[PDB]
């Protein structure tokens, strides 16, 4: 059902599949056409097996501009979380080009800020995996605000925690 504990658990499983498979099929395949991996496969390559703990897996955008609300993919275009690399703590974000062309929006901006704050708070490096067409135009100035919030963190974290950018 849906009104029983068992049904609620089954429901989570369905959402998990959807979240782990966001981004249209005709996009995930084109990316694969090139010598590229998915945003999630890149995180797997980097982090030690079984160490990845995802944050905001079910985040969804709040825009209603230019029909953007027609689809609200779980994760909103970026995969974020914490894990370990060679047994040491690392925070990571991996932009998903298959979702809205990887264009950076408000919630997608906020997810990056959350991992950045987590890294600063716990004192570990941040590895950012970039693959984005640019700002999510539909969101207007909200997209620029998101960039700004990230830039501020980059600057405050400079010389505090290692920040490595992987551009793929």
């Amino acid at each position: 059902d849906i009104h029983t504990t068992a049904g609620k658990l089954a429901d989570l499983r369905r959402r998990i599949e959807e979240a782990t498979h966001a981004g249209s099929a005709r996009a995930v395949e084109k990316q694969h056409a090139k010598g590229k991996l998915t945003a999630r496969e890149r995180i797997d390559l980097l982090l030690d097996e079984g160490s990845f703990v995802e944050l905001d897996e079910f985040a969804r955008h709040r825009s209603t501009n230019f029909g953007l609300d027609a689809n609200r993919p779980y994760g909103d275009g970026v995969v974020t979380g914490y894990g370990t690399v060679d047994g040491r703590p690392v925070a990571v974000f991996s932009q998903d080009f298959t979702v809205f062309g990887g264009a950076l929006g408000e919630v997608y901006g906020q997810k990056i800020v959350k991992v950045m704050d987590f890294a600063l708070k716990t004192g570990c490096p941040v590895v950012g995996i970039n693959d984005s067409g640019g700002a999510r135009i539909q969101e207007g100035v909200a997209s620029l605000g998101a960039y700004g919030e990230i830039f501020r963190r980059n600057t405050h974290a400079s010389g505090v925690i290692p920040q490595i950018s992987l551009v793929v």
């Binding site: 658990l9 905001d56 703590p89």
Partner: protein, 353 residues
């Protein structure tokens, strides 16, 4: 033994007070003076015995059966705390096996189908702690909330959790003060705090309001917002209105907030919500008030009485399978143990009293 007159204020300022049933008493004024001044008759045990101070006054943290048991309780207490505030609690490191065990699976079915049927939160707590060992403090006082210590991978942690099995697990004056001082005790001594949430709201009552729930309930919010030790919160089932915010929410500073699929995070109950949200649509076409309302209530429950809207906004970091709580707590504490945080400089805060 006896602790009478102003002398009781010393133990009061200390962190934990342990009494012995039937052979220890604490009181500012004795029965004699009370009788001559107020004419009221009261016995020593009823006035300030160990049971009284562990269940009514909120002064004692434990009632032992005898002196030997009391001393053991003290040793246990010390084993979870550091020697001073410059050190992290004493730890005997041990790597946990994160493979899902039969015990972990038990959590998937611990939550009843019926919303009003309670479950013992003690079981949830024990499932995430090493050896399923939970050292409870103030068990007899404000049973609607649980406080105590445990260990995760050998490292001491503090626990705060609503108990739906007692008084519906609602937050009242006593529960708020009980949990508030415990969180501050943990924080002052570098002990991480794990919070388990299942709160329907605040306990209704003219007595609660007249006794100062506004200023006393706020102590818990202050405790969580002030804490700089690692804070991990898990919402098992109910999380409505202000109570949701008070129980170690991310908005107060919780570092990792998890929610089971059974979690219901909403501003208020569905019935109460629809009466407001739809008072006009229900006024019109009064030929079907009870039919239109019932339909509106069902839709509100199915749409918002879950944790997915909070998850959309990042108020909760993840919605997890109940059986995966231990894994999330273990991996969470590993990363958060290096947490460094500070509040604005000040002589001290001005917490409500």
């Amino acid at each position: 033994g006896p602790c009478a007159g102003g002398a009781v204020y010393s133990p009061a300022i200390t962190d934990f007070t342990v009494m012995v049933d039937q052979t220890s008493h604490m009181f500012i004024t004795g029965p004699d003076v009370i009788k001559t001044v107020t004419g009221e008759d009261v016995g020593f045990e009823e006035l300030g015995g160990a049971r009284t101070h562990n269940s009514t006054s909120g002064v004692a943290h434990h009632m032992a059966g005898d002196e030997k048991d009391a001393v053991e309780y003290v040793k246990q207490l010390l084993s979870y705390l550091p020697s001073n505030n410059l050190s992290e609690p004493p730890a005997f490191p041990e790597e946990a096996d994160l493979a899902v065990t039969d015990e972990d699976a038990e959590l998937d079915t611990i939550v009843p189908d019926s919303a009003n049927q309670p479950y013992d939160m003690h079981s949830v707590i024990e499932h995430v702690l090493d050896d399923a060992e939970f050292f409870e403090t103030q068990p007899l006082f404000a049973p609607n909330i649980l406080t105590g210590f445990g260990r995760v991978e050998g490292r001491p942690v503090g626990i705060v959790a609503n108990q739906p099995m007692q008084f519906a697990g609602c937050l009242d004056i006593t529960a708020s003060e009980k949990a508030a001082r415990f969180v501050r005790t943990c924080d002052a001594f570098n002990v991480p705090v794990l919070t388990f949430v299942d709160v329907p709201g605040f306990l209704p009552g003219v007595d609660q309001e007249h006794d100062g729930i506004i200023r006393r309930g706020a102590k818990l919010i202050f405790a969580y917002a002030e804490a700089t030790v690692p804070l991990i919160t898990v919402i098992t089932r109910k999380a409505f209105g202000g109570a949701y915010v008070v129980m170690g929410s991310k908005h107060l500073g919780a570092d990792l907030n998890l929610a089971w699929p059974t979690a219901q995070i909403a501003v208020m109950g569905a019935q109460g919500a629809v009466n407001i949200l739809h008072r006009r649509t229900i006024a019109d076409a009064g030929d079907d008030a009870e039919a239109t309302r019932a339909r509106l209530i069902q839709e509100y429950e199915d749409a918002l009485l879950n944790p997915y809207t909070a998850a959309e906004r990042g108020y909760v970091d993840a919605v997890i399978m109940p059986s995966d709580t231990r894994r999330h707590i273990v991996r969470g504490l590993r990363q958060l143990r290096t947490k460094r945080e500070s509040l604005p400089p000040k002589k001290h805060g001005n917490i409500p009293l």
